[PDB]
Amino acid sequence: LSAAAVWRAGLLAPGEVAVAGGGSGGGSFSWSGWRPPVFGDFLIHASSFNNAEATGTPLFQFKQSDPFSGVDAVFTPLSLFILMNHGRLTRMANLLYDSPATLADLVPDFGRLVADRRFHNFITPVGPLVENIKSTYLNKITTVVHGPVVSKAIPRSTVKVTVPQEAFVDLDAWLSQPCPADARLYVALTYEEAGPRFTFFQSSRGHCQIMNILRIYYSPSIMHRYAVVQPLHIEELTFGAVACLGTFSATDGWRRSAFNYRGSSLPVVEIDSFYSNVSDWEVI
Amino acid sequence: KIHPGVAMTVVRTDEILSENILFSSRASTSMFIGTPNVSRREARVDAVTF
Amino acid sequence: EYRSTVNPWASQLGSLGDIMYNSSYRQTAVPGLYSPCRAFFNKEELLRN
Amino acid sequence: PTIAHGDGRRPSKQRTFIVVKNCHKHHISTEMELSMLDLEILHSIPETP
Amino acid sequence: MDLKVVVSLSSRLYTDEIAKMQQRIGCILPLASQNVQGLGLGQVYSLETVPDYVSMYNYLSDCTLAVLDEVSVDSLILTKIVPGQTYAIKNKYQPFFQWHGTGSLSVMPPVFGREHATVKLESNDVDIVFPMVLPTPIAEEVLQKILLFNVYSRVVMQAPGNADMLDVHMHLGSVSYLGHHYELALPEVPGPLGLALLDNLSLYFCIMVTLLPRASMRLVRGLIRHEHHDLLNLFQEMVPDEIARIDLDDLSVADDLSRMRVMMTYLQSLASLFNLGPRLATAAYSQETLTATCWLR
Amino acid sequence: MDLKVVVSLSSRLYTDEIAKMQQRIGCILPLAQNVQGLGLGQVYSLETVPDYVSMYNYLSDCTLAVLDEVSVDSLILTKIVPGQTYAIKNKYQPFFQWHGTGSLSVMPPVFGREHATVKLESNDVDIVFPMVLPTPIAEEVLQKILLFNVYSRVVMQAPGNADMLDVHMHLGSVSYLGHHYELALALLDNLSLYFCIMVTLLPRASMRLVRGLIRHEHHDLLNLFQEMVPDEIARIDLDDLSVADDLSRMRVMMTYLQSLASLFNLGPRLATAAYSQETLTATCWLR
């Protein structure tokens, strides 16, 4: 047809190509673009891991203060939340892990780092996990650190990103039409007198304007602070910090699925076609 | 308009447009010519630059 | 060959003529402007010749 | 080549200058802009005039 | 990847306005996602509302911008702004700003008057006003000027013996540029969202005034008692009473480190507040033909 | 897509420029191309004092570029797009750290002028690289040199209230993730000038803004909980001064906090992904 006749230009090769001449200009045939992401490979303790958790889970590396350690473990916000509950949703949190001892003593100081309230600049997000071998010792994982999520192997499978629904708060559902094209996903630290918390935020707005609306949402959590405490040894005036995890497509919305352990059921928000981009920590 | 104790030496600069005449003898320079190569400096979707 | 210099304030090492237009004492001037006499009193272009 | 001197003032030896020379590389560059839709309509095929 | 997003009108665009839309080619317009309304800035900046320049700032920052390059009748072509592509933008705005600075570019609401960025469209029930494009230093200076004006015009209105209303409208007044001074458009009431911005700014201010490094106080006292600098002209050889009364204590170094730590973090938070509105990084703005390759930062 | 930019050298070199560029083959460098307008050699020039904030603005102004290879006549380097990734090695005069560090800064070299500066006598361009160094390292270093300049200028001002030993035990030492590094020393004089005039005008500005915004909302829980915060002595004097000079002080306050606000952002914020320690290179991309 004429569609198959006009197919020769629109077949492949992003950009174009000067087909002949005194010189050949441009070669992009047999490569359909779609820039592959770089892979941040980590080697964690298998005692710091759970094999039963799904692949597309946003991770958080705590960087080791120790020089004599080639290895470094990871934190997920489930593991992080049960670590806050051990340092002091819980019934979900105990269902996963047995011993929080090696995770709490894995970081050298955990009550001190919340005492100085500098927990945000020691936790570097490495985005969603994709690649995962299974070993009893020194297990090696790999996460798409920046760019689009994809498996390692030549089957280049899309990996849906599992963020827990109970730890996730919507922005626009609580705010109740600027740009429905961009859909960005933010994680936010949150301090409290009981125990700190990690939460997640879906937003369809831009990155820079999102913090001022987050303060408006977040204000009843800050009205409870400073009535019962007053900071000495001066720290603690910061109350949480936010960063960008990346963007995803708002054309296909998040579809809730069931990440189940054998103990009970646990609903999860699935993010498909996520474009990971870890930015810097922005305090409130 | 009384003279001070000292004397001064002004120094100016003066750029002048001048046509020169350039001579060179025959075969004073050897030269290697390279063949040209066309490369894409930036792939803009509105207009790619060569 | 019968006098050393016609002017003392512009000929010795630390004369007024050097400290106005040396590279070695213009350490707080703006590099945007031009100076005529800086083409003489610079030490580096003197030792390059 | 040297003359041979009349008086034996100094011996006139071979003076072989062995001199090396450098290759001055220059990289001439420019750019030429081409619109994308012109490249698209280059790669398409004509049916109507 | 696609950039070409066509937008249909709904009725016949009249031939008197196709000439000026031919004149406004290559300008920037704010998107909505198509439809006809909101594709522009008339829906949030109308004649009815006092122009607060903050809710329309919320709309232009929150929405992806768009280049208008081709206008026809009953159809006009738009091109979105997606990061990673170096868009060609022509400075076609009647308050002229040469980009001799070749710095980062900035978009702002039409604070230079309604007439300069508007266009009438008697085809449909839609009118279009345009966002202003202007360099980074002028944009941040006009931003801090319009915030300082909407916070101080209200307190000048709060004065009972307001003998001088025209003091700030001629001292604050115009904009700072070496080519000319260009008078802007000034609201009288700040609006809700403007006072929300001043609320968060004053929150940062009262949090940061609780920690001042005390060594710096000694430095400005010593420099006042040194020669009066050209940068020190704003003091005109005077020590304020407040810095004289917060130097009753001595010079330490232990509190200075944590003071400076929280000052770095809160100044980066203030920068994140003031890096608001979408920004363009420029490579090689060509002077002779008024076009600039720019990509979204 | 070829982002490689050749810089044509005017004069032929010899072996020391080869040894220093192959000593510096990893580090990055600004741009405008031409051989003269290449590095920080227009701002680290000795014809003036090499200032800090203009150096920062010029570095953020032009784009950044990594050097790849040096020949006798060419200087092969590659610039940076925010679209794709690149490689980066240290090859620096301090060998500090790349500890998996999710954020990276590019600062102008504040340790030493000639520590980064490869000085070439054949061409007087005196090219000099910016320091690549991770982000908390960069913030701690800028803090500890800003306070160092304030303390040095206040002990030059009056030798009674300040000493040097108890700040050399305190702010001459930077420490981060089990590594303890050392740093000691007029650009920082201009920086501390900006910092001191900022914190000097800050009380008047803050008290004027809180008296402006204090009772707009007639009952907010946040408003009261943030207005019981400030100093009880920082809230006396406003109406003694006029309107005009006060608003001029507000204007200079605002432009100075904006300039220092972008300046305490760490410049061209590079980002690393996976650092191989046995190779001394990191995978980078601009962000």
Side-chain angles (χ1 to χ4, degrees), chain A residues 1-29 31-284, chain B, chain C, chain D, chain E, chain F:
Chain A
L1 277 75
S2 169
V6 77
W7 199 244
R8 199 255 166 264
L11 173 61
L12 272 162
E16 268 301 321
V17 45
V19 291
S24 316
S28 170
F29 205 78
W31 182 278
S32 194
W34 181 45
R35 284 195 179 96
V38 74
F39 282 167
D41 65 330
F42 301 126
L43 62 163
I44 72 182
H45 295 305
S47 65
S48 178
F49 196 49
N50 167 44
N51 184 32
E53 68 180 63
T55 170
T57 300
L59 278 174
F60 288 96
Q61 161 171 22
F62 170 65
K63 190 46 186 215
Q64 300 295 331
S65 65
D66 218 19
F68 311 137
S69 90
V71 293
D72 190 6
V74 299
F75 283 56
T76 206
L78 295 149
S79 304
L80 181 135
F81 171 59
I82 194 54
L83 269 161
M84 315 323 294
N85 201 2
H86 178 236
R88 71 183 185 90
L89 263 296
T90 282
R91 66 190 194 277
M92 303 295 118
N94 299 120
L95 196 66
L96 322 165
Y97 279 6
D98 178 72
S99 89
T102 195
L103 280 79
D105 290 331
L106 202 167
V107 53
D109 64 277
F110 205 61
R112 196 210 167 271
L113 210 62
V114 68
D116 46 57
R117 287 264 193 123
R118 273 219 322 256
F119 195 42
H120 56 89
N121 48 18
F122 268 95
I123 301 309
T124 172
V126 303
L129 156 73
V130 172
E131 301 99 340
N132 190 7
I133 67 167
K134 290 100 192 169
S135 69
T136 183
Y137 67 100
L138 321 180
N139 218 10
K140 171 153 195 152
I141 60 177
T142 304
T143 169
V144 173
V145 47
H146 171 251
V149 290
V150 63
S151 161
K152 158 78 195 170
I154 300 311
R156 304 161 293 180
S157 301
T158 182
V159 193
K160 316 156 156 303
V161 193
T162 66
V163 53
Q165 188 193 321
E166 281 86 354
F168 158 71
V169 190
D170 188 289
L171 183 69
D172 48 71
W174 188 84
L175 263 293
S176 283
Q177 43 94 33
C179 170
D182 164 53
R184 271 217 179 97
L185 178 64
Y186 310 111
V187 67
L189 189 143
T190 292
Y191 294 119
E192 200 81 342
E193 289 80 46
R197 197 164 58 252
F198 254 45
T199 182
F200 287 86
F201 287 103
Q202 176 262 322
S203 314
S204 168
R205 302 133 191 248
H207 173 74
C208 319
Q209 195 61 251
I210 213 60
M211 193 207 49
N212 319 121
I213 317 298
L214 184 142
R215 190 183 292 109
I216 294 190
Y217 157 74
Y218 191 62
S219 317
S221 175
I222 78 175
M223 82 172 43
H224 181 215
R225 200 190 57 87
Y226 204 49
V228 313
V229 298
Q230 282 215 8
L232 190 135
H233 199 59
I234 174 68
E235 314 294 320
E236 191 204 344
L237 285 182
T238 175
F239 204 52
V242 70
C244 197
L245 275 190
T247 83
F248 66 100
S249 49
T251 80
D252 189 333
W254 35 274
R255 265 156 184 81
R256 303 172 184 178
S257 73
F259 158 64
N260 265 250
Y261 203 70
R262 293 144 273 276
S264 84
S265 201
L266 170 62
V268 67
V269 170
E270 284 273 25
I271 289 287
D272 39 356
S273 57
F274 191 69
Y275 178 68
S276 87
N277 171 226
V278 43
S279 192
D280 36 8
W281 286 109
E282 323 200 73
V283 300
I284 298 104
Chain B
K1 266 291 194 305
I2 175 178
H3 193 289
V6 285
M8 267 158 281
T9 295
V10 190
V11 172
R12 304 183 291 170
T13 308
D14 282 315
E15 157 192 27
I16 287 162
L17 177 63
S18 71
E19 301 294 342
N20 40 29
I21 287 179
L22 170 80
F23 181 71
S24 88
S25 43
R26 51 98 177 174
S28 312
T29 42
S30 47
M31 192 163 52
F32 304 139
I33 315 294
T35 39
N37 48 313
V38 192
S39 87
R40 312 206 318 188
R41 182 69 166 258
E42 192 269 304
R44 177 57 178 101
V45 173
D46 285 27
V48 300
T49 78
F50 285 164
Chain C
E1 315 194 23
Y2 85 110
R3 88 175 78 96
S4 91
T5 176
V6 69
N7 43 355
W9 294 322
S11 176
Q12 274 78 12
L13 283 166
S15 70
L16 189 149
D18 200 359
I19 55 160
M20 282 319 123
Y21 319 113
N22 206 305
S23 87
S24 88
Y25 314 119
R26 269 199 160 184
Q27 312 299 318
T28 174
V30 171
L33 266 295
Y34 179 77
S35 277
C37 320
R38 208 204 164 239
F40 310 100
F41 292 99
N42 272 326
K43 167 152 141 194
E44 198 270 346
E45 69 99 26
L46 209 55
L47 61 90
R48 188 193 35 84
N49 281 21
Chain D
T2 177
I3 65 173
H5 266 280
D7 182 271
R9 315 155 177 92
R10 278 298 98 209
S12 298
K13 283 166 59 69
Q14 279 104 349
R15 304 193 223 176
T16 292
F17 282 3
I18 174 68
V19 56
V20 288
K21 273 300 212 164
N22 45 359
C23 43
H24 306 271
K25 273 180 290 223
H26 308 263
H27 273 317
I28 310 166
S29 88
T30 171
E31 61 254 11
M32 36 182 276
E33 198 64 81
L34 277 304
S35 317
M36 191 86 194
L37 73 158
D38 275 346
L39 268 63
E40 163 54 42
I41 202 166
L42 166 67
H43 272 251
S44 155
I45 47 173
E47 288 81 35
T48 181
Chain E
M1 55 188 75
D2 190 12
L3 305 188
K4 194 173 41 175
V5 172
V6 55
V7 160
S8 301
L9 285 85
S10 200
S11 202
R12 188 71 190 198
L13 186 142
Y14 291 97
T15 182
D16 48 6
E17 307 153 350
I18 193 161
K20 58 190 60 166
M21 289 288 85
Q22 274 303 290
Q23 195 255 358
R24 295 282 261 192
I25 280 182
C27 300
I28 314 292
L29 280 192
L31 170 55
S33 176
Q34 257 172 85
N35 42 357
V36 54
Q37 68 100 29
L39 276 180
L41 219 44
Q43 59 157 351
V44 70
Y45 165 52
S46 298
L47 185 47
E48 303 296 334
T49 315
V50 174
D52 54 353
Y53 310 117
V54 293
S55 47
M56 64 191 95
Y57 207 106
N58 158 269
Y59 189 58
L60 61 91
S61 157
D62 280 30
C63 168
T64 46
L65 267 179
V67 194
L68 167 62
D69 52 352
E70 199 276 330
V71 285
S72 78
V73 290
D74 301 30
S75 68
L76 85 170
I77 317 174
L78 289 191
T79 303
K80 309 163 294 180
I81 294 304
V82 159
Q85 281 74 244
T86 55
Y87 296 90
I89 297 106
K90 269 208 308 296
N91 197 0
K92 264 207 147 189
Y93 311 98
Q94 318 152 26
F96 210 97
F97 297 104
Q98 73 271 37
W99 296 335
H100 184 205
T102 76
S104 173
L105 211 44
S106 314
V107 290
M108 294 290 315
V111 309
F112 282 85
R114 187 179 176 87
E115 61 90 26
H116 97 283
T118 180
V119 53
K120 328 291 291 158
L121 213 71
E122 313 310 288
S123 69
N124 311 95
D125 49 0
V126 178
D127 193 280
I128 308 300
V129 287
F130 274 52
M132 199 56 188
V133 187
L134 59 154
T136 293
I138 308 176
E140 260 65 24
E141 213 275 317
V142 165
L143 174 53
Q144 74 89 10
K145 279 188 80 70
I146 187 63
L147 299 183
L148 281 196
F149 177 66
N150 60 55
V151 73
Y152 291 148
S153 89
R154 61 171 299 274
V155 74
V156 164
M157 189 255 306
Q158 290 303 96
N162 190 7
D164 293 286
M165 186 74 196
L166 274 160
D167 45 355
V168 290
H169 294 62
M170 74 183 180
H171 167 50
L172 185 137
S174 199
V175 312
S176 54
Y177 199 60
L178 169 74
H180 199 48
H181 74 283
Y182 316 93
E183 186 42 74
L184 62 98
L186 297 78
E188 274 67 35
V189 284
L193 202 149
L195 277 191
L197 177 58
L198 309 177
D199 170 76
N200 301 153
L201 178 52
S202 316
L203 174 144
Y204 279 3
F205 267 23
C206 308
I207 286 303
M208 79 182 72
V209 72
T210 41
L211 309 99
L212 277 301
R214 300 265 71 82
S216 60
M217 317 278 103
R218 266 293 315 177
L219 200 51
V220 68
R221 287 151 80 96
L223 254 190
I224 281 178
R225 300 325 303 126
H226 205 76
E227 62 94 10
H228 214 58
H229 268 272
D230 38 355
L231 298 173
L232 261 65
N233 183 26
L234 85 166
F235 297 143
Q236 49 272 17
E237 202 80 13
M238 280 195 327
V239 191
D241 305 1
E242 208 76 323
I243 198 150
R245 77 172 48 229
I246 63 187
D247 274 312
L248 165 61
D249 308 332
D250 200 77
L251 179 141
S252 65
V253 76
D255 197 56
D256 206 321
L257 180 76
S258 277
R259 269 170 184 168
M260 202 43 75
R261 162 172 287 106
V262 79
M263 277 318 115
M264 307 335 282
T265 51
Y266 276 143
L267 261 289
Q268 283 159 25
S269 84
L270 190 137
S272 199
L273 179 55
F274 270 171
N275 195 287
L276 77 174
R279 294 286 89 85
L280 273 302
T282 294
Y285 160 68
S286 84
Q287 216 284 327
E288 294 286 327
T289 171
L290 191 44
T291 182
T293 63
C294 291
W295 67 98
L296 190 66
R297 157 168 83 181
Chain F
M1 188 179 40
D2 203 359
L3 275 303
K4 178 248 296 178
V5 169
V6 190
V7 166
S8 81
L9 296 156
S10 85
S11 94
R12 191 196 176 180
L13 50 77
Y14 55 103
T15 198
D16 70 333
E17 303 160 68
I18 297 309
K20 297 320 158 315
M21 294 332 111
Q22 285 157 9
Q23 191 264 302
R24 297 304 276 262
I25 208 57
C27 46
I28 69 175
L29 200 164
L31 270 189
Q33 269 148 350
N34 191 4
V35 68
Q36 254 93 14
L38 177 73
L40 298 171
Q42 280 83 29
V43 69
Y44 261 116
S45 186
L46 275 303
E47 293 160 340
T48 186
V49 290
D51 208 350
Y52 187 70
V53 196
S54 158
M55 184 172 307
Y56 169 77
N57 280 158
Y58 158 71
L59 186 65
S60 46
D61 193 68
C62 51
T63 183
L64 278 302
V66 70
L67 158 64
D68 174 275
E69 202 262 4
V70 54
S71 77
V72 177
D73 209 347
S74 67
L75 177 81
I76 291 194
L77 53 90
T78 314
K79 48 177 194 308
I80 304 280
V81 76
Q84 73 185 0
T85 184
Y86 278 118
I88 179 61
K89 318 169 59 54
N90 170 264
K91 284 297 194 34
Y92 266 124
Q93 200 266 343
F95 296 90
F96 283 157
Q97 214 49 253
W98 319 101
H99 264 166
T101 307
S103 290
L104 172 57
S105 187
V106 183
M107 206 52 54
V110 291
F111 318 119
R113 279 80 168 169
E114 53 94 16
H115 301 177
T117 308
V118 281
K119 310 257 198 218
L120 316 191
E121 75 173 340
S122 93
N123 304 72
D124 46 349
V125 70
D126 76 330
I127 47 173
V128 42
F129 314 102
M131 275 294 150
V132 192
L133 65 155
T135 39
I137 297 275
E139 289 158 306
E140 211 197 321
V141 159
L142 260 72
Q143 284 188 60
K144 274 187 191 312
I145 67 169
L146 179 70
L147 304 179
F148 188 38
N149 184 289
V150 173
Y151 280 133
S152 64
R153 271 304 188 264
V154 77
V155 75
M156 288 193 181
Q157 166 64 233
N161 48 359
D163 50 349
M164 201 81 94
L165 266 162
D166 291 22
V167 307
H168 258 293
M169 297 284 271
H170 275 149
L171 59 96
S173 154
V174 293
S175 275
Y176 174 71
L177 313 184
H179 272 246
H180 160 268
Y181 304 119
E182 166 57 58
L183 157 71
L185 280 80
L187 70 170
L188 270 304
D189 170 65
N190 196 15
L191 188 45
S192 48
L193 268 171
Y194 296 143
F195 198 99
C196 77
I197 199 155
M198 168 72 249
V199 304
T200 307
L201 271 302
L202 185 146
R204 173 163 321 275
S206 48
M207 90 169 283
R208 174 78 260 202
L209 264 295
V210 67
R211 201 158 301 192
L213 276 299
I214 190 55
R215 306 304 313 121
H216 155 58
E217 185 71 31
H218 308 122
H219 204 176
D220 177 31
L221 278 80
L222 172 56
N223 177 220
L224 50 90
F225 277 142
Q226 65 95 26
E227 66 95 15
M228 43 199 61
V229 187
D231 200 357
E232 271 67 53
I233 210 59
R235 36 179 206 78
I236 286 91
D237 63 273
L238 279 169
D239 72 332
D240 41 356
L241 208 65
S242 85
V243 57
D245 52 341
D246 176 88
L247 262 73
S248 89
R249 286 157 81 105
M250 294 329 166
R251 228 179 53 199
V252 61
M253 163 268 303
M254 273 304 172
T255 176
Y256 276 17
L257 57 78
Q258 277 187 335
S259 71
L260 274 72
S262 165
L263 183 51
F264 297 152
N265 195 348
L266 311 178
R269 181 179 304 271
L270 185 45
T272 57
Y275 176 73
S276 56
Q277 187 65 262
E278 76 202 52
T279 77
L280 185 57
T281 194
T283 65
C284 55
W285 77 106
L286 197 48
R287 186 174 35 164

